[PDB]
């Protein structure tokens, strides 16, 4: 029978073994000391939704928005990627900044959009983040949703807000519709057309969304887009 007295601090954090973590910290483990992957204990507590460990580590002076890992992200980024609304709320109550960008150029609303975490997207918008916030690559949450979430939400949720459906990203000028067409995201195409996506708006290479549909020889996408012109 394993009683966790031999587990190291990282593994005990991941699994939420509260008393093991506390005894190691009191025996001298610095809560700010990263592991060999440049990841802090707060990161592991956040991505495994360890609410109480998160309070404890922060009360011991853990840096709330410390960048770590290969993607160079805050603990709140990690929680957002993983989908823990309770952790996102908790970290933002202790002052975590949802607008910080990670090493892929994304702030939290973009991360929540691209991994389909609809209630986190709604929460960030409810807390004031702009629905059309651009990340470092010029992507909006709606573009990320079109590109990466082949599902009704979070796209349906984003369109309940005064979104500007025809913006293009900064370095391609691809609209959300362009992205949905590139990705073959047929669920999202109908929602964007119903929301007013212009099928002829051209990107930086002069291709419209309908041009991209023709290129892919997808009759369903060509038909749907043409009937909305």
């Amino acid at each position: 029978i394993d009683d966790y007295s031999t587990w190291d601090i990282v593994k005990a954090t991941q699994y939420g073994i509260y008393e093991r973590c506390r005894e190691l910290v009191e025996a001298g483990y610095d809560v700010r000391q990263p592991d060999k992957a440049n990841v802090t204990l707060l990161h592991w507590a956040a991505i495994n939704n360890r609410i109480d460990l998160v309070k404890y580590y922060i009360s011991k002076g853990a840096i709330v928005d410390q960048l770590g890992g290969d993607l160079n992200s805050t603990p709140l980024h990690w929680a957002t990627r993983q989908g823990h609304l309770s952790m996102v709320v908790q970290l933002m109550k202790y002052g975590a900044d949802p607008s910080l960008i990670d090493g892929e150029g994304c702030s939290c609303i973009h991360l929540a959009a691209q991994f389909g975490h609809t209630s986190i997207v709604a929460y960030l918008i409810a807390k004031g983040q702009d629905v059309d916030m651009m990340d470092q690559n010029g992507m909006t949450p709606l573009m990320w949703a079109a590109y990466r979430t082949h599902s009704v939400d979070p796209t349906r949720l984003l369109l309940t807000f005064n979104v500007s459906v025809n913006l293009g990203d900064k370095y391609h000028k691809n609209t959300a519709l362009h992205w949905a067409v590139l990705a073959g995201n047929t669920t999202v195409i109908s929602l964007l057309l119903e929301a007013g996506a212009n099928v002829d708006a051209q990107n930086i290479k002069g291709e419209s969304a309908l041009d991209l549909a023709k290129q892919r020889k997808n009759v369903w996408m060509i038909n749907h887009l043409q009937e909305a012109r």
Binding site: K11, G16, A37, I47, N48, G69
Partner: peptide, 10 residues
């Protein structure tokens, strides 16, 4: 399972 790997590039 728990999360024991850091987030990675897609």
């Amino acid at each position: 399972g728990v999360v024991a790997s850091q987030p990675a590039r897609v």
